[PDB]
RNA sequence: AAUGUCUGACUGCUCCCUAGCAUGCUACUACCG
RNA sequence: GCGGUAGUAGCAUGCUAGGGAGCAG
């Protein structure tokens, strides 16, 4: 676009020396210990942006087994029949934080507030009606993130122009909010982990299986390696809720717009325009939900491959052969849907393979002897499926497995689970990774978060997150929480000292003493409000 | 919250009616409020009775009743007088010193800075009161001369959107952060202020935006008197501790010297023999030569050159360009044009060329301050702040033109009063002297030496037989802000018709519009005396249009007559400067 | 102890970057390389030698007058 | 949409929409414009209408400022005041609005029809802003009058110079003059294209 | 709120109250006086508060309509900005070569990724290292996209000019290294 | 909320009510000291309320302006706070090589590149005058960063190659003071 | 002389502060039945 | 002696809005 390519760099973090001195004073960070410093603010040099955009070369054309795909799409759709969707007028959308960036070229004249505030409802509804009959390609901008981590690769997020979000919202928001407000479903987006939420989620996923084991896997390069066909399938499954609002050509044109805007459009990395080959752009209007859909798809595909690739004569139960036999029927011999088969197979899966799905992050409670015999899917089936349908090799060092069903998950949403007796019963609790909390305490973005006096609130939030460590059988772990509390006390004391010093007033009332006392914190995890 | 600017004892109080609002210990604040017109003190809260409308701003009439402040007619039965026991009710009351001669600041605060005696007062106190007088003198300038401001609001629109209107004809000052006004609402009754207020224009008038200190309702019958406002506080010394060294401390002189600067090798060494040096270089005596020879004599040193106007810094730049390698020199420009052949703005450099307002924050081996004549104590403060060098060189000549004191109207600042380095050049005298005038003719050199150099300026070139003079008053006509002598210009026209080789001469006059009408009639290049400082010409025509202390100023006449390289003509309105001028006279 | 090395390396890179060193290109690449290598080291000795190699950069310039702060 | 009154030039965002050109009137000036003539429609940057559904009452004198909108006498909220009060219509700049009494010639031009000579007589002997307003109004009126005309279908094109043109049915045909320039329209079936401008004689 | 007719009635009620209670007469006097105080404070219970509600609603409507005026103003402003940007961008393309390659398109509808590949004049090449500079930008001209390009200026990361001499096999590890080569379409 | 005239009013109300309940008065008199004491509370609660509201308002204004002053004054001085923090950390580390080069630099010896680590890869140093040369370069060896270096070339400020044995205390003024040494790693 | 502006995606949950409104609860006072 | 409405203050819950922050994919 302009005569010189821009080179963007990433600065290093900031050090909070007071907290570090505190923590070493109380005997932390010992040599050879377990808790330590692993999360820093890694810096990047010049050609960082382009060297990360280059990671799309792992996206290759992929041709899918059309028949088994046409079956699993029906089953996935059946996983999704408890919600309600459809178009909505302009005067019903809900935008949180109208003060974010508006993509490229619009960001030259203000944030999203401007465009969401300078177009009457008529113009917005007219824009929707227009894209229901045309195609509007757009430009996507690539931005560099700046946040703590534990691996020194740069990370980028895509900023989609306002023309895409302003309409994708009206197309999808009703179904999205209907998903984010349902309890006990398979997709668990929107379910808070506080006030017993973790316990309810674990109990629901557990749910009446026979010989339960746990299992969880991991997709390498999830957002850059997803082939186009499964993205299109996910968009169709989402649009399936539109049988009455839109007419047929309208739905195709909406599909075409979403493809041309978030699947293979120009990208404004550096200062020049490139061509995105495929895969999602993590920042569009519907990332987490489409990822959930794609996740369920892969799970079902693995179960199907497992059941079909097993010898028939070795099957003991008559009903299971019947299932495998008629499954081969409905896959290849038949030509159109058969609702009862889909129903009873979906019920079979719900009995032998219960799942808990947040975006690309799953936990499975499954029969163990069936799995051993080869009637549901184990890790090996996932590996094979990812190989031939995702073009990646899932290494087995990242797929945990659990047998006792009492020490939860090993890890889900980067939290560990512990079974603690609270009140008079035994509840589940989530607890983070201590090195993460200490790192968050020591290293901050801006130099005003490095003066604890002004910012005690973030220490309160961090302690709220660190609470469940107190119940750990180890010993440094509880000391984390207690260190945070004593820090808060120290900050409040020095603050009153300073105030009395510069002016001479003393505060009249504080009600801050409830912050360094450990029932205000434990209230969060036991069940009420 | 601060230190008593006289006592350093820690003060939480500020002097309200005083222009700078300084810190005075309970005893010093007491002394000021009983010895001046200042009856308002500023602390965490302004000192006034808080009964509705009770505008008691006299520090001596307040009594701490309950938790609020009260007058006599308002104090509840539990109170006491603040202004008592020789001190005021102010924090750190025990650790109060009380300056002995508060009359110093008491006079610096209640003056007008239009009298030279106030400048003597500023020049003749301690360094702390020196920088205080600096800040207050710049504050007096800005509050008077530099822009202005009262405006009355037309009506309110929103919390930060307001219709204004100044008084038709009154100075309408720019709308910036460094422009705030005291917001006054007068009920009938109740001349009460609503705080301090900056304003800015938006995208439509006259509904403008304002930032207010207080959070009060702004009524439609309000107005915002312009305040004694905008300066920058000074916290930097003036003449560093003079330390004569017996050795060239920290400089490695070269093993080979050039003849051009061979005339000054003892001079450069004596610069190295001291903390700082001051040299008297008359116009056209090789000041820039000496300045570059400083660095050429110590080749392995980091030097920074500074001067007031961009023009002199650029002159040193071109002199260096001739003698100093371009790779090691650097021109510093502020965000007007000037030098740029050097690398623009490079702090890590051997030779740095920057004006006094645009200095960076770093160290150096030597800072050579050029144009000491236009230097004031603020300038010394800022050059000592922004640079930390082991050696300083104050090159110039106090007998030349100074920085103009526009707010000054009555009196004449002796060159001893332009600054304090110039003061030392008129007391201890310049440590050195450029005793070779390689610009002016023998007549002009002997003239300026018998005038403002004490017969000590030596004439390099001989009697050119072209430095002329004419005693002609002319008719002194005045237009808006100058003086124009058309008969004087007439005898100059007659000279041009008689001397066509003098059509190349530079018309000089103590003013601007006399120059303008001369150009409109003569056509010759017409420049002023101040703009000619730093410029030398072959033939010169100086027409002293008037006989005021400006036109007849011996510094002004000195520098204007030194502008000549070959010859000069002087249509003299004054007889004194005519006879003191040893030129070839002419008939009218 | 090793944590102290990692921490002072963070602070040093911050100082360098605020001294405008990233304007130059190859130098900033080297500084970033050494910093990211120190943050992942496991034993103290080689971390110390990377630390000295990286401090040499700040010493090679005349923006920070160490003879001032080295007053204790 | 904030401007200076066309009579007293105090800042304002008031217009009487029933006047064809909608000029900027001050509060006093707009009050005088609405109580005297037939312009019973006033609009600021937002319209003044009973925001009740089904109640389409027009004049502002029968409106009452409610909670957030203006409602009629009927669907009024209990806590509400009218929009015509003390000779100023409720709008921006109530206190600095000065007005005057030159509403006479203002109503004269805002109520005239330009079909008589005396109207043009007055339009030539009025104030500067009034003169520009009169010019504007009469140009808009003659534009609407010319648009009140219609079409003209071709019977035969004798040559590029001689034309057989018949004019609209039941329509006053435009005389053979040079000023009335005619743009031509030829539809394919489907897409009527502008075939250029033509003069007659 | 002080010049109010209900407040004037309140005031005369209080006046009659203090008067006819100062001359203490009968119990009927005190009864009528208390009733009059009641009706007076009934007047000033609404004429003191409901008009404050009128004021608050007028003020919020006024502020809202000011902000609406600001909305429409910034609206017109961004409109002007967009259109001027479009015009200035357009005034840089209309070479007749573009018109030509569009005419030779059977329907006028051509792909986009080839427009700068044919009609553009300037080229910018970014080269990672020396070996890649050897294969592709050599001499003072080279051929790419079926045309000849005459090299015209070279720069490095800091964008400091580099003559074609310095790109030696051995001088190479002395410059930044993504070098930006600008070229021109030969003819 | 004691310092109130309404406090005196309410306290007199309480005292009179206590007198009424303690003297065994009649039925209507205590109603005068109950309706007046309750109007007294309806005024005293109210004035104490409004005063504590204004107090807490001023208090939060104070904490806000304090926050602002603190934040801005710290943002002003990062460029120096960072340097002093860095150097106290460096001094607390206490390693031999670090302190070696810091002391060499505070004397005047600074490198002219990055100190390499392999046994190849040259290294250049600036020597200010010859004393430190005595304390350092002794023969063909060179000790810098607590490691051994072989001198391979010397030169003074005017780019003149200077022989090894050429330098000595006597001939010292025969050289430009800022010498430059080019060594390699042992 | 200006002034002014610089890359920050889509979601979900949570804490803190403020404002508004209604509602809900309780007390004090007033009028009338 | 009760009811009711109107007021005012206190207190609570909830909803919306505005701002500051934290974690997660
Ligand atoms: Zn639809
Ligand atoms: Zn004192
Ligand atoms: Zn004073
Ligand atoms: Zn008083
Ligand atoms: Zn009208
Ligand atoms: Zn008007
Ligand atoms: Zn109505």
Curated annotation (Swiss-Prot), chain A:
Cofactors needed by this protein, per the record, are: Mg(2+)
Q: Where is this region: Interaction with RMP Remdesivir?
A: 145-155
Lineage top rank: taxon: Viruses
Q: Which intervals of the chain are annotated as region RdRp Fingers N-ter? A: 1-181
Binding positions (Zn(2+) 10):
87, 242, 245-246
- What's the stated role of this polypeptide? RNA-directed RNA polymerase that catalyzes the transcription of viral genomic and subgenomic RNAs. Acts in complex with nsp7 and nsp8 to transcribe both the minus and positive strands of genomic RNA. The kinase-like NiRAN domain of NSP12 attaches one or more nucleotides to the amino terminus of NSP9, forming a covalent RNA-protein intermediate that serves as transcription/replication primer.
Self-association and partners: Interacts with nsp7 and nsp8 to form the replication-transcription complex (RTC): nsp12, nsp7, two subunits of nsp8, and up to two subunits of nsp13. Interacts with nsp9.
Q: What is this protein called?
A: RNA-directed RNA polymerase nsp12
To which species is this protein native?
Severe acute respiratory syndrome coronavirus 2 (2019-nCoV)
Q: Which gene encodes it?
A: rep
């Amino acid at each position: 676009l302009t005569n010189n390519v821009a080179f963007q760099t990433v600065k290093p973090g900031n050090f909070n020396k007071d907290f570090y001195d505190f923590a070493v004073s109380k005997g932390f960070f010992k040599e050879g210990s377990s808790v330590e410093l692993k999360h820093f603010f890694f810096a990047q040099d010049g050609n960082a942006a382009i060297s990360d955009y280059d990671y799309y070369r792992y996206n290759l054309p992929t041709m899918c087994d059309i028949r088994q795909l046409l079956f699993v799409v029906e089953v996935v759709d059946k996983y999704f029949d408890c919600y309600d969707g459809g178009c909505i007028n302009a005067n019903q959308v809900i935008v949180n934080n109208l003060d974010k960036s508006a993509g490229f070229p619009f960001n030259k004249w203000g944030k999203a507030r401007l465009y969401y505030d300078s177009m009457s409802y008529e113009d917005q509804d007219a824009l929707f009606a227009y894209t229901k009959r045309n195609v509007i390609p757009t430009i996507t901008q690539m931005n560099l993130k700046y946040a703590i981590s534990a691996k020194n690769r740069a990370r980028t997020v895509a900023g989609v122009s306002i023309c895409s979000t302003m309409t994708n919202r009206q197309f999808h928001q009703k179904l999205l909010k209907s998903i984010a407000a349902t309890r006990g479903a398979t997709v668990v987006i929107g379910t808070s982990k506080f006030y017993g939420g973790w316990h309810n989620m674990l109990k629901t996923v557990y749910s009446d299986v026979e010989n339960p084991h746990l299992m969880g896997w991991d997709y390498p390069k999830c957002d850059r390696a997803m082939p186009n066909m499964l993205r299109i399938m996910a968009s169709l499954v989402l649009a399936r809720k539109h049988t009455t609002c839109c007419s047929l050509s309208h739905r195709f044109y909406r599909l075409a717009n979403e493809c041309a805007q978030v699947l293979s459009e120009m990208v404004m990395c550096g200062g020049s325009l490139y061509v995105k080959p495929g895969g999602t752009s993590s920042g569009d209007a519907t990332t987490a939900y489409a990822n959930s859909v794609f996740n369920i798809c892969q799970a079902v595909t693995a179960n199907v491959n497992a059941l079909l690739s097993t010898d028939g004569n070795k099957i003991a139960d008559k009903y299971v052969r019947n299932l495998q036999h008629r499954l081969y029927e409905c896959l290849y011999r038949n030509r159109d849907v058969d609702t009862d088969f889909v129903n009873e197979f979906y019920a079979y899966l719900r009995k032998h393979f219960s799942m808990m799905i947040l975006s690309d992050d799953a936990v499975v409670c499954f029969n163990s002897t069936y799995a051993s015999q080869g009637l549901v899917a184990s890790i090996k089936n996932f590996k094979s499926v990812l190989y031939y349908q995702n073009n990646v090799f899932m290494s087995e060092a990242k797929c945990w497995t659990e047998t006792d069903l009492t020490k939860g998950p090993h890890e889900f949403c980067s939290q560990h689970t512990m079974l603690v007796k609270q009140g008079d019963d035994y509840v589940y609790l989530p607890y983070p990774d201590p090195s993460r909390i200490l790192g968050a305490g020591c290293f901050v973005d801006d130099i005003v978060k490095t003066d604890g006096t002004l910012m005690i609130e973030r220490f309160v939030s961090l302690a709220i997150d660190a609470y469940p460590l107190t119940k750990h059988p180890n010993q440094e772990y509880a000391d984390v929480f207690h260190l945070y509390l004593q820090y808060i006390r120290k900050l409040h004391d020095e603050l009153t000292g300073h105030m009395l010093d510069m002016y001479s007033v003393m505060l009249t009332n504080d009600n801050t003493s409830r912050y360094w006392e450990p029932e205000f914190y434990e209230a969060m995890y036991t069940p009420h409000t | 919250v601060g230190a008593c600017v006289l006592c350093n004892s820690q003060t939480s109080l500020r002097c309200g009616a005083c222009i700078r609002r300084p810190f005075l210990c309970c005893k010093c604040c007491y002394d000021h409020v009983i010895s001046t017109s200042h009856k308002l003190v500023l602390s965490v809260n302004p000192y006034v009775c808080n009964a509705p409308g009770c505008d008691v701003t006299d520090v001596t009439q307040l009594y701490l009743g309950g938790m609020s402040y009260y007058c006599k007619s308002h104090k509840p039965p539990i109170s006491f007088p603040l202004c008592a026991n020789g001190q005021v009710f102010g924090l750190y009351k025990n650790t109060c010193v009380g300056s002995d001669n508060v009359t110093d600041f008491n006079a610096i605060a209640t003056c007008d800075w239009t009298n030279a005696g106030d400048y003597i007062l500023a020049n003749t106190c301690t360094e702390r009161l020196k920088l205080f007088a600096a800040e207050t003198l710049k504050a007096t300038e800005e509050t008077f001369k530099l822009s202005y401001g009262i405006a009355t609001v037309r009506e309110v629109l929103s919390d930060r959107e307001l219709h204004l209107s100044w008084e038709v004809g009154k100075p309408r000052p720019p709308l910036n952060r460094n422009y705030v006004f005291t917001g006054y609402r007068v009920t009938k009754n109740s001349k009460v202020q609503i705080g301090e207020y900056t304003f800015e224009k938006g995208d439509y008038g006259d509904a403008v935006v304002y930032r207010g200190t207080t959070t009060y309702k702004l009524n439609v019958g309000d107005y915002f008197v312009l305040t004694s406002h905008t300066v920058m506080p000074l916290s930097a010394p003036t003449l560093v501790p003079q330390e004569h060294y017996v050795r060239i401390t920290g400089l490695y002189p070269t093993l080979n010297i050039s003849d051009e600067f061979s005339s000054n090798v003892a001079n450069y060494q004596k610069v190295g023999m001291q903390k700082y040096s001051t040299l008297q270089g008359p116009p056209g005596t090789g000041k820039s030569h000496f300045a570059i020879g400083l660095a050429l004599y110590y080749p392995s040193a980091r030097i920074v050159y500074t001067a007031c106007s961009h023009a002199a810094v650029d002159a040193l730049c071109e002199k260096a360009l001739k003698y100093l390698p371009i790779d090691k020199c650097s021109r510093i420009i502020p965000a007007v044009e000037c030098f740029d052949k050097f690398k623009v703005n490079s702090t890590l450099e051997q030779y740095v060329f920057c004006t006094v307002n645009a200095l960076p924050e770093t160290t150096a081996d030597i800072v050579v301050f050029d144009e000491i004549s236009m230097a004031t104590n603020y300038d010394l403060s800022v050059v000592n702040a922004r640079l930390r060098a082991k050696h300083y060189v104050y090159i110039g000549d106090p007998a030349q033109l100074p920085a103009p004191r526009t707010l000054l109207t009555k009196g004449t600042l002796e060159p001893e009063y332009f600054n304090s380095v110039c003061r030392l050049m008129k007391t201890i005298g310049p440590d050195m002297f450029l005793g070779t005038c390689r610009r002016c003719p023998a007549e002009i050199v002997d003239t300026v030496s018998a005038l403002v150099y004490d017969n000590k300026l030596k004439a390099h070139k001989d009697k050119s037989a072209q430095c002329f003079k004419m005693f002609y008053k002319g008719v002194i006509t005045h237009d808006v802000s100058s003086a124009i002598n058309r008969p004087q210009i007439g005898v100059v026209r007659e000279f041009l018709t008689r001397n066509p080789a003098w059509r190349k001469a530079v018309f000089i006059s103590p003013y601007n519009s006399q120059n303008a009408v001369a150009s409109k009639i003569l056509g010759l290049p017409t420049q002023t005396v101040d703009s000619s400082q730093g410029s030398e010409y072959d033939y010169v025509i100086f027409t002293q249009t008037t006989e005021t202390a400006h036109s007849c100023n011996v510094n002004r006449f000195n520098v204007a007559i030194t502008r000549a390289k070959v010859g000069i003509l002087c249509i003299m309105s004054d007889r004194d400067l005519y006879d003191k001028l040893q030129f070839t006279s002419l008939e009218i | 102890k090793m944590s102290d090395v990692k921490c002072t390396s963070v602070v040093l890179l911050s100082v360098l970057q605020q001294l405008r060193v990233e304007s130059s290109s190859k130098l900033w690449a080297q500084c970033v390389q050494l910093h990211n290598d120190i943050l992942l080291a496991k034993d103290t000795t080689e971390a110390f030698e990377k630390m000295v190699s990286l401090l040499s950069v700040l010493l090679s310039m005349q923006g920070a007058v160490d003879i001032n702060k080295l007053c204790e | 949409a904030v401007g200076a009154c066309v009579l007293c030039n105090s800042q304002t965002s008031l217009r009487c929409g029933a006047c064809i050109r909608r000029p900027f009137l001050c509060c006093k000036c707009c009050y005088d414009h609405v109580i005297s003539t037939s312009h019973k429609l006033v609009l600021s940057v937002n319209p003044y209408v009973c925001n009740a559904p089904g109640c389409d009452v027009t004049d502002v004198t029968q409106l009452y400022l409610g909670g957030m909108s203006y409602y009629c006498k009927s669907h009024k909220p209990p806590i509400s005041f009218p929009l015509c009060a003390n000779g100023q219509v409720f709008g921006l700049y109530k206190n600095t609005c000065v007005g005057s009494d030159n509403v006479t010639d203002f109503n004269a031009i805002a109520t005239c029809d330009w079909t008589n000579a005396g109207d043009y007589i007055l339009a030539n002997t009025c104030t500067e802003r009034l003169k520009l307003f009169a010019a504007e109004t009469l140009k808009a009126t003659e534009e609407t009058f010319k648009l009140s005309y219609g079409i003209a279908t071709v019977r035969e094109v004798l040559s590029d110079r001689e034309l057989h043109l018949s004019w609209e049915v039941g329509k006053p045909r435009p005389p053979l003059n040079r000023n009335y320039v005619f743009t031509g329209y030829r539809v394919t079936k489907n897409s009527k294209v502008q075939i250029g401008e033509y003069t007659f004689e | 709120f002080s010049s109010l007719p209900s407040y004037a009635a309140f005031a005369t009620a209080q006046e009659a109250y203090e008067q006819a209670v100062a001359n203490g007469d009968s119990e009927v006097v005190l009864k009528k006086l208390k009733k009059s105080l009641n009706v007076a404070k009934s007047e000033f219970d609404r004429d003191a508060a409901m008009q404050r509600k009128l004021e608050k609603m007028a003020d919020q409507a006024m502020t809202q309509m000011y902000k609406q005026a600001r909305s429409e103003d910034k609206r017109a402003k961004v409109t002007s900005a967009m259109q001027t940007m479009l015009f200035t961008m357009l005034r840089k393309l209309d070479n007749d070569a573009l018109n030509n390659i569009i005419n030779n398109a059977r329907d006028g509808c051509v792909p986009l990724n080839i427009i700068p590949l044919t009609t553009a004049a300037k080229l910018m090449v970014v080269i990672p290292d020396y070996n890649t500079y050897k294969n592709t930008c050599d001499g003072t001209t080279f051929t790419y996209a079926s045309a000849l390009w005459e090299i015209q200026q070279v720069v490095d990361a800091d964008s400091k000019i580099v003559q074609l001499s310095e790109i030696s096999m051995d001088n190479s590890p002395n410059l930044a290294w993504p070098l930006i080569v600008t070229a021109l379409r030969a003819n």
